[PDB]
A paper describes a structure:
Family 2 DHODH enzymes use respiratory quinones as electron acceptors. Amongst the 6 enzymes of the de novo pathway, DHODH is the rate-limiting step and the key enzyme connecting pyrimidine biosynthesis to ETC at the level of ubiquinone.
The crystal structures of inhibitor-free EtDHODH and EtDHODH-ferulenol complex were determined at resolutions of 3.5 Å and 3.65 Å, respectively. Both crystal forms contain four EtDHODH chains per asymmetric unit. The fact that; (i) there are no significant intermolecular interactions in either crystal structure, (ii) EtDHODH migrates at similar sizes with PfDHODH and HsDHODH, i.e., around 45 kDa, in high-resolution clear native electrophoresis using dodeylmaltoside buffer (micelle size of 72 kDa) and visualized by CBB and DHODH activity staining collectively suggest that EtDHODH is functionally monomeric, consistent with other family 2 DHODHs such as those from human and P. falciparum. EtDHODH contains two domains connected by an extended loop and corresponding to a small N-terminal domain (N-terminus to Ala31) and a large C-terminal domain (Asp43 to the C-terminus). The small N-terminal domain is the enzyme’s membrane binding region, which forms two N-terminal amphiphilic helixes (αA and αB). The large domain of EtDHODH contains additional antiparallel β strands (βC, βD, and βE) at the top of the barrel. The long insertion region of EtDHODH (residues 218-243 in the inhibitor-free structure and residues 217-239 in the ferulenol complex structure) is missing from the final structures due to the insertion sequences’ poor electron density. In the ligand-free EtDHODH crystal structure, the electron density map of the N-terminal helix region (αA) was disordered, indicating the high flexibility of this region. The N-terminal extension found in DHODHs from other apicomplexan parasites, such as P. falciparum, T. gondii, and Neospora caninum, is not conserved in EtDHODH.
Residue numbers in the entry: 18 to 217, 244 to 402
The structure:
């Protein structure tokens, strides 16, 4: 069952008993991305550590970054169980958590905690922190709820991710329209424009940098081409930092086996690879690679990753892999990714970005 596989791995992570990394990762993997130094391009995807529980553990376990939940502002319970199925036969997961956070009241000090204690012991080669934020199912003006995730938990972020594509929350995937998208992105970056004083990183608004998280938008793979062109023609113009370029898909492709394949939810995993990998490409090269890209959806192998890294992502989030291959999907993908850099010719990762569109 994925539900408690997700939860015991999170528990074993929370007290930290899971196996750690060691070899200190070769610098070929170093990826600078609009001023954020990521050690590893592999990270954890925006659904595993929901309520900011144990980011730094999974981090020390070989992910160069994690991305905390989606944090709504008021606590939610989401949808009744059973809400998330394995589709074993084609390495896939339908899910329908319909958001289910503890809230910005609860996670604010959980980051305050992680923000202070991340600098101290082990003298870290800082593993990067992404904060993912969203709306209470039935919120009136969604422009009002994104505004709180910034005001609250956004100063703790190495990168804030406005979630606008969970197929399971009440008309949330419909916010990605030129007029709505632009409003939410502006309103968010109006809030990051709350820069304030001190004595007038450990102390201060602390993020492997002065502050002001590199902002991000999460979009569904189920976009039109009509509208990917809008979304893009917005992003450059809004000066959006980057796009996390794959939530789950609502789609249910033919050639799918495990009998649960008909279930209402967000399909993740293998059949989100081709889906997702093409929808990186159309955003890197519909934005001159100017708008940074972190991609997820079916990334389970260095070859999967490099394949997609080339395509235009400077980083790679994992979850459905992480349930099948285990927690060592981080180090196993790192290793395969590295070998594919030597064999190919251009070592490193930064070099390989945009290589499908390189002039
Ligand atoms: C059980 C589950 C919960 C998820 N929760 C979230 C979430 O809260 N916020 C979010 O932005 N994405 C969420 N996602 C989407 C994943 O973060 C990821 O983008 C998607 O699964 C595709 O990646 P993968 O197929 O490589 O795991 C979730 C996915 C799954 C399977
Ligand atoms: O609410 C959910 O269940 C959900 C959110 C999300 O962002 N992605 C997903 O697959 N499910």
């Amino acid at each position: 069952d994925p539900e408690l596989a997700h939860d015991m791995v999170m528990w074993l992570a929370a007290k930290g008993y899971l196996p750690y990394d060691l070899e200190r990762d070769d610098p070929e993997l170093s990826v600078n991305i609009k001023g954020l130094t990521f050690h590893t391009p592999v990270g954890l995807a925006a659904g595993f550590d929901k309520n900011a529980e144990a980011p730094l553990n999974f981090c020390k376990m070989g992910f160069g970054f994690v991305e905390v939940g989606t944090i709504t502002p008021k606590p939610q319970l989401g949808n009744p169980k059973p809400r998330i199925f394995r589709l074993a036969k084609d390495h896939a997961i339908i899910n329908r958590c319909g958001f289910n956070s503890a809230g910005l009241d609860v996670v604010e000090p959980r980051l305050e905690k992680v923000s202070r204690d991340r600098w101290h012991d082990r003298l870290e080669r800082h593993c990067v922190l992404g904060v993912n934020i969203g709306k209470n199912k039935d919120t009136v003006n969604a422009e009002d709820d994104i505004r709180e995730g910034v005001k609250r938990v956004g100063r703790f972020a190495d990168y804030l991710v406005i979630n606008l594509s969970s197929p399971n929350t009440k008309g949330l995937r419909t916010l990605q329209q030129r007029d709505h998208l632009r409003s939410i992105i502006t309103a968010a970056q109006s809030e990051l424009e709350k820069l304030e004083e001190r004595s007038r990183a450990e102390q201060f608004f602390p993020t492997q940098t002065g502050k002001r998280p590199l902002l991000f938008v999460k979009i569904a793979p189920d976009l039109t081409d009509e509208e990917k062109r809008d979304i893009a023609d917005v992003a450059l113009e809004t000066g959006l930092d980057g796009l996390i370029v794959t939530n789950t898909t609502i789609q249910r492709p033919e050639s799918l086996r495990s009998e649960s394949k008909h279930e209402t939810g967000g399909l993740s995993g293998r059949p989100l690879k081709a889906m997702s990998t093409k929808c990186v490409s159309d955003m890197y090269k519909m934005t001159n690679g100017q708008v940074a890209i972190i991609a997820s959806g079916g990334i389970e192998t260095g070859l999967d990753a490099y394949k997609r890294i080339r395509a235009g992502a400077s980083a790679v989030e994992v979850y459905t892999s992480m349930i099948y291959r285990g927690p060592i999907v981080a180090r196993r993908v790192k290793d395969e990714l590295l070998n594919i850099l030597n064999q190919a010719g251009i070592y490193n990762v930064q070099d390989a970005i945009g290589l499908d569109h390189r002039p």
